[model samples]
Target: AATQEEIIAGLAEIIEEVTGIEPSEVTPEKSFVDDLDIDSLSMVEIAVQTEDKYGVKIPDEDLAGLRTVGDVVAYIQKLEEEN
Candidate 1:
């Protein structure tokens, strides 16, 4: 079964909670590097934890394109749909 938008929103909410960043700040144009203060290491950490939480793999190469929280949610939803 595929995950829903609400689930993706919840995932973003959890990310905000863990990172201490405001959910409002996470938009489609916000870069995780420039806007979120998240470095490469932090990206890896986020990816690992997010994948575990969502039961998805989020390929490292694919992750490079995910600059915003919306991107992450979209990516997850796309994968969920694919499955």
Candidate 2:
């Protein structure tokens, strides 16, 4: 099983790759829009990449609920466990 830290790290890496933000800047408390300045289109891209990389299908409705990096991490963790 992947640890929470591992999930966060993976998420940070993916976010950095997609957004060109530094991995160190992607903290759990950081908001994608407020902190990283990622627009809606970028967020959609991130969601798509996350789904592909983590093998979790994130419905469009649920994307609105994910504000912080930690939110996404927790969501992904839950999906992984259920699967």
Candidate 3:
């Protein structure tokens, strides 16, 4: 099992890798589009890396609900529990 912070950190890394942004810029309050300048492609890339890293698929509808780093972490945690 992974801690919430671990999930957030993984999400931050994925965002950084896909967006050329810094992990330092990813905060719980940061909005994916406004704060990180993330676009549709970046979001999809993050989703792919997240599924690969955590071995969980974030459904498209759920992915549409994700907006912040905390959102991703919470979603992944839910999936972790479900699995």
Candidate 4:
């Protein structure tokens, strides 16, 4: 079982809530840097939002590598499902 779309939607909303970006603008192919044009501060904020919402732990080092939308969603999914 996979919660790809659900996770994506949740992430999209978090991005919107944090940065005011349009939810529809967030997709698996979009990168937080090159694609979303978001900065490090925004990245941290996004991760914080998801961390609380999904109960997934996200460290600074992990956020550094999860720059893409799909990557963030997958991380949320993995941590969310395990426990």
Best by TM-score: 2
Regarding lDDT, does 3 or 4 come out ahead?
A: 4
- C-alpha TM-score for every candidate: 0.70, 0.87, 0.85, 0.86
lDDT, each prediction:
0.70, 0.81, 0.77, 0.81
> Candidate 4: misplaced stretches above 4 Å?
none
For candidate 2, lDDT tens digit of each residue in 14-83? Answer: 8788878877788887687877788777888888887898767788898887888888888878888765
Sort by TM-score, top down from the best:
2, 4, 3, 1
Q: For residues 1-83, what per-residue lDDT tens digits would candidate 3 score against the true structure?
A: 78867776777777778977777777777677756679866788888887887677877788777887788877778778765
**Candidate 1 Cα RMSD after full superposition onto the native fold (Å):** 2.7
RMSD (CA, Å), candidate 4 to true, equals 1.6
Q: How many clashes does the backbone of model 2 have?
A: 0
Worst 10 residues of 2 by lDDT: 74-83
lDDT of 1 by residue, 37-78 (tens): 877667777788877875677888987877776677777777
lDDT of 4 by residue, 18-45 (tens): 7788989998987887778888888998
Question: Which run of 10 residues does model 3 get worst, by summed lDDT?
Answer: 27-36
Instruction: Please give the distance, in angstroms, between residue 28's alpha carbon in candidate 2 and its true position after superposition.
Output: 0.8
The residue ranges of model 3 lying beyond 4 angstroms of the native Cα positions read none
